[PDB]
Amino acid sequence: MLTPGNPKWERTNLTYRIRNYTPQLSEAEVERAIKDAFELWSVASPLIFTRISQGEADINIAFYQRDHGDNSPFDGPNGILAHAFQPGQGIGGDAHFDAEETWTNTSANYNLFLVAAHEFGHSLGLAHSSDPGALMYPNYAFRETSNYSLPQDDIDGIQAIYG
Template sequence: MQFVVLFTVGFLTSGFSLPMPREAGEISEKQWKEAQNYLNNFYASDTEKELSNFEDKIKKMQRFFGLSITGVMNPNIMEIMKQPRCGLPDIAPSGFTLFPGPRKWTSKIVTYRIAIYTNQLRHSRVDSIVYRAFNMWSRETTLYFKRVPRGPADIIIRFARRAHGDNYPFDGPGGTLAHAFTPGPDIGGDAHFDDDEKWTEGYKSGINLPFVVTHELGHSLGLSHSSNPNAVMYPTYNKNDPWDFQLSQDDIRRIQQLYGKKRNVWDIYYREENTPS
């Protein structure tokens, strides 16, 4: 009996761990823990719990990124998981949706304010980057954007580190770059950027701030992530993305579904002048 007891204790304290589940594929135990966190953050719907079916979540991710749907982890999925990305989930971003119904602004004029700047770029450069990002969306929609120097605004923009008061803390360099909330009152529409990232402008090493700002403001206007790798609203950041980027046709189509297409003033004038009375 003494032998059995000693054997049992030795068995339990020898570093024995349960076998990896089938859906983990051939990745390591450390990678599997990282993958579980990623899947819980970006592919768990409201009704799913922390210990829900990871095979189903893997399939959702594979479907979103246009991969073979196997429900099993592989090196391609791990590579995607390692890429810097937006902090919003790719499905059911309920934590960033603050009210039911259509996620859009009802006013044609949307105000914004930059509340906290990064020290990595001059304030005037950040002002210019944000202005150009708003203008990129404005050219394709019926919306107009107005900057206010102080006080309330529809969209508040700020740079922050780690925990910053919205229950969605940043994680330091790499990983999550930024996040934004869908249109609505209070924090609705606000966009936050991780100031632990190396923000740059132009052809330099680091994260292209104009690209990330344009992406996050798409969320501030009500857009979810796109599975089109050419879209600004694609969730992951690729250092090979062009610095002189433009909105893709997918981005334009989706924003116009929310707000309509901007009509050319001269076209309106011509139509009114030439319409039979």
């Protein structure tokens, strides 16, 4: 459940910045998906997340197409949905999303809130779970989002790292 090397943030109060947006959702919807994704982890740990739109944030969020500077290119529809970097300075903790995906806040692939929540797990130092119902499961599966709360295994995962 934990990323090898046990990379974790030394600070519990982290900032995130939405560098750009997918035009498939309104900016507010994107901001809501991201805000709610972070809250999932914050309510199960001592972690606090604050958004900033200027300056350097701990977790940069951005939608990119194919090659985007970090040598891990996106690949068009499906396949690689997004990826994040383990806790650390610079690009560490950042989360990138494939701009070529259909991004939604519905049951249709892919629900941004869910993918973001999952990616932030990586941003916080969590690895994949074998539990099919866990947010950190390796493959995407829609789950009702209207009242989504961190699944038990994911709560155990973040608690294991940050208490």
